[PDB]
Amino acid sequence: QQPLNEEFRPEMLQGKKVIVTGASKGIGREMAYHLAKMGAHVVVTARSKETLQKVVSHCLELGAASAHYIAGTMEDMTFAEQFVAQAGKLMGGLDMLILNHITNTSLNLFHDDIHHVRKSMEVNFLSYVVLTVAALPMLKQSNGSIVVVSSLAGKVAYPMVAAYSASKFALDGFFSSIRKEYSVSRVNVSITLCVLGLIDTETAMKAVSGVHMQAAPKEECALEIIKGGALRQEEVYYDSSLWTTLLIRNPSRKILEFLYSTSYN
Amino acid sequence: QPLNEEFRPEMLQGKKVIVTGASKGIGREMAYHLAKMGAHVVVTARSKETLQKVVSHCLELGAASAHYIAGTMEDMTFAEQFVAQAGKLMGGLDMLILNHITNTSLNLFHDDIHHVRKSMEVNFLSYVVLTVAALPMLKQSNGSIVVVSSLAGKVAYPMVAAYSASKFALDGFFSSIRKEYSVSRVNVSITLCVLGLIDTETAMKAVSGIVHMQAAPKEECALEIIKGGALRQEEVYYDSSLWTTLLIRNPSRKILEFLYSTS
Ligand SMILES: NC(=O)c1ccc[n+]([C@@H]2O[C@H](COP(=O)([O-])OP(=O)(O)OC[C@H]3O[C@@H](n4cnc5c(N)ncnc54)[C@H](OP(=O)(O)O)[C@@H]3O)[C@@H](O)[C@H]2O)c1
Ligand SMILES: NC(=O)c1ccc[n+]([C@@H]2O[C@H](COP(=O)([O-])OP(=O)(O)OC[C@H]3O[C@@H](n4cnc5c(N)ncnc54)[C@H](OP(=O)(O)O)[C@@H]3O)[C@@H](O)[C@H]2O)c1
Ligand SMILES: C[C@H](CCC(=O)NCCC[N+](C)(C)CCCS(=O)(=O)[O-])[C@H]1CC[C@H]2[C@@H]3[C@H](O)C[C@@H]4C[C@H](O)CC[C@]4(C)[C@H]3C[C@H](O)[C@]12C
Ligand SMILES: C[C@@H]1CN(c2ccc([N+](=O)[O-])cc2)CCN1S(=O)(=O)c1ccc(C(C)(C)C)cc1
**Three-class secondary structure of residue A146 per DSSP:** strand
Architecture of the domain defined by B1-263: 3-Layer(aba) Sandwich (3.40)
Using CB atoms and an 8 Å cut-off, which of residues 118-147 of chain A contact chain B?
Answer: 118, 121, 125-126, 129-130, 133
**Cβ contacts of B104-112, under 8 Å, gap ≥ 24:** B104/B160, B104/B162, B104/B163, B104/B206, B105/B162, B105/B163, B106/B159, B106/B160, B106/B206, B107/B159, B108/A181, B108/A185, B108/B158, B108/B159, B109/A177, B109/A178, B109/A181, B109/B161, B109/B162, B110/A133, B111/A133, B112/B162
Please indicate whether, in this complex, the C-beta atoms of A133 and B125 are within 8 angstroms of each other. no
To one decimal, the resolution in angstroms is: 2.3
Whether residue A172 contacts residue A123, with contact meaning beta carbons closer than 8 Å, is answered with no
Phi, psi of B216 (to 5 degrees): -105, 150
Please indicate whether, in this complex, the C-beta atoms of B173 and A165 are within 8 angstroms of each other. yes
Ligand 2: distance of its center to the CA of B127 in Å? 13
Architecture of the domain defined by A1-265: 3-Layer(aba) Sandwich (3.40)
Please tell me if residue B155 touches chain A, with a CB cutoff of 8 Å. yes
- Which of B157, B170, B199, B246 for mutating ligand 3's site (highest number of atoms within 8 Å of CB)? B157
**Integer Cα distance of A64 and A241 in angstroms:** 33
Please indicate whether, in this complex, the C-beta atoms of A156 and B257 are within 8 angstroms of each other. yes
Select from A117, A158, A173 the Cβ nearest to the Cβ of B167. A173
Per the DSSP assignment, residues forming a β-bridge with B68 are B43
Whether residue A123 contacts residue A74, with contact meaning beta carbons closer than 8 Å, is answered with yes
Select from A157, A185, A255 the Cβ nearest to the Cβ of B108. A185
Experimental method: X-ray
A122 vs chain B: nearest CA distance in angstroms?
A: 8
Residue B195: CB within 6 Å of ligand 3?
no
Residue A248: CB within 6 Å of ligand 4?
no
Select from B76, B153, B176 the Cβ nearest to the Cβ of A158. B176
Which candidate, B105, B88, B87, places its Cα nearest to that of B96?
B87
Residue nearest ligand 1's atom 42 by CA: A22
**Integer Cα distance of B28 and A144 in angstroms:** 47
Ligand 3: distance of its center to the CA of B195 in Å? 9
Ligand 4: distance of its center to the CA of A22 in Å? 18
Please tell me if residue B209 touches chain A, with a CB cutoff of 8 Å. no
Nearest CA in chain A to B256: A247
Using CB atoms and an 8 Å cut-off, which of residues 10-69 of chain B contact chain A?
Answer: none
C-alpha dihedral, A151 to A156 to A161 to A164, nearest 10°: 50
Ligand number nearest to the C-alpha of A180: 3
Please tell me if residue B8 touches chain A, with a CB cutoff of 8 Å. no
Which candidate, B120, B136, B133, places its Cα nearest to that of B172?
B120
Find the farthest-apart pair of alpha carbons in chain A and give their distance in angstroms, rounded. 53
**Integer Cα distance of A107 and A211 in angstroms:** 13
- Domain range list for chain A: 1-265
**Integer Cα distance of B103 and B114 in angstroms:** 13
B7 vs chain A: nearest CA distance in angstroms?
A: 28
